[PDB]
Design an enzyme around this catalytic site. Structure first.
Site, short mmCIF file in Angstrom:
data_model
loop_
_atom_site.label_atom_id
_atom_site.label_comp_id
_atom_site.label_asym_id
_atom_site.label_seq_id
_atom_site.Cartn_x
_atom_site.Cartn_y
_atom_site.Cartn_z
CD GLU A 61 -2.88 1.13 0.19
OE1 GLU A 61 -3.90 0.42 0.22
OE2 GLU A 61 -2.57 1.85 -0.80
CG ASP A 89 -3.52 -3.04 2.71
OD1 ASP A 89 -3.53 -2.32 1.69
OD2 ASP A 89 -4.53 -3.28 3.37
CE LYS A 115 -10.52 -4.36 3.31
NZ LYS A 115 -10.45 -3.32 2.25
O1 GK0 Z 1 -11.81 -0.05 -1.54
C1 GK0 Z 1 -10.81 0.62 -1.33
N1 GK0 Z 1 -10.60 1.91 -1.88
N2 GK0 Z 1 -11.51 2.63 -2.67
C2 GK0 Z 1 -12.13 2.16 -3.74
C3 GK0 Z 1 -13.04 3.14 -4.49
C4 GK0 Z 1 -13.68 2.77 -5.68
C5 GK0 Z 1 -14.49 3.70 -6.36
O2 GK0 Z 1 -15.16 3.32 -7.55
C6 GK0 Z 1 -14.65 5.00 -5.88
O3 GK0 Z 1 -15.47 5.93 -6.57
C7 GK0 Z 1 -14.00 5.37 -4.70
O4 GK0 Z 1 -14.14 6.66 -4.19
C8 GK0 Z 1 -13.20 4.46 -4.01
C9 GK0 Z 1 -9.66 0.01 -0.54
C10 GK0 Z 1 -9.74 -0.38 0.81
C11 GK0 Z 1 -8.60 -0.94 1.39
O5 GK0 Z 1 -8.49 -1.41 2.71
C12 GK0 Z 1 -7.47 -1.09 0.63
O6 GK0 Z 1 -6.44 -1.67 1.27
C13 GK0 Z 1 -7.37 -0.72 -0.70
O7 GK0 Z 1 -6.17 -0.92 -1.43
C14 GK0 Z 1 -8.48 -0.16 -1.29
MN MN Z 2 -6.48 -2.29 3.12
MN MN Z 3 -4.65 -1.69 0.02
#
Ligand code: GK0
Ligand code: MN
Ligand code: MN
Length: 177
Positions: A61, A89, A115
């Site tokens: 990450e 991550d 998750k």
């Molecule tokens: O889901 C995550 N991030 N955001 C995704 C996301 C997707 C979209 O289509 C949007 O419009 C937005 O604002 C965020 C997310 C959550 C975590 O714990 C991670 O470790 C990671 O790498 C991503």
């Molecule tokens: Mn994460």
């Molecule tokens: Mn991540």
């Protein structure tokens, strides 16, 4: 909330979070709760990576996507571990597994399940933290010692307390879908 993020998180985290948002076409100055959530997740990931021995963890990450996948494919070849479908991550060199870290404003069990559905892989370990001292990890295996984990849970409670003091917590707590 934009003032809050810029004063509670170091500039390197803030810069990464702004970039990630702009990559989705969101303005950090408008979607300020998402901004805060990204910063908090990044800080927890960096805190977790410091929790072990030196060299215990590789950080995935916070890296641009090309370097992140270079690190992941490198580890899969070096160790023979299954290649994930999504970037995790961290990688744990002691336990020989990838870690997915979650930080939730709702409840740890719901977030663990979401998750586990998305990741949908046997291999990747999942560790979830809340802002109210709760955690939840795969096979009840929490990876770090209690002192490291308590320092993370304490930082999150502290962020929660700071937002509350500014009447930001209610909107923040309610913005997670
Ligand atoms: O889901 C995550 N991030 N955001 C995704 C996301 C997707 C979209 O289509 C949007 O419009 C937005 O604002 C965020 C997310 C959550 C975590 O714990 C991670 O470790 C990671 O790498 C991503
Ligand atoms: Mn994460
Ligand atoms: Mn991540």
């Amino acid at each position: 909330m934009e003032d809050f993020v810029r004063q509670c998180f170091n500039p390197m985290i803030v810069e990464l979070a702004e970039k990630a948002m702009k990559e989705y076409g969101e303005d950090p100055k408008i979607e300020t709760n998402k901004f805060a959530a990204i910063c908090t997740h990044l800080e927890v990931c960096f805190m977790y990576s410091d929790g072990g021995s030196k060299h215990r963890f590789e950080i995935i990450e916070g890296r641009d996507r090309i370097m992140a996948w270079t690190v992941v494919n490198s580890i899969c070849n070096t160790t023979g571990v299954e290649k994930p479908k999504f970037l995790p991550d961290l990688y744990d060199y002691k336990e020989n597994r990838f870690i997915e870290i979650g930080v939730t404003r709702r409840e740890v069990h719901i977030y663990y399940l979401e998750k586990a559905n998305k990741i949908k892989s046997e291999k990747t370990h999942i560790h979830i933290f809340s802002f109210t001292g709760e955690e939840m990890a795969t096979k009840a295996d929490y990876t770090l010692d209690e002192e490291s984990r308590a320092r993370i849970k304490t930082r999150l409670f502290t962020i929660r307390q700071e937002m509350a003091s500014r009447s930001l917590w209610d909107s923040f707590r309610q913005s997670e879908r």
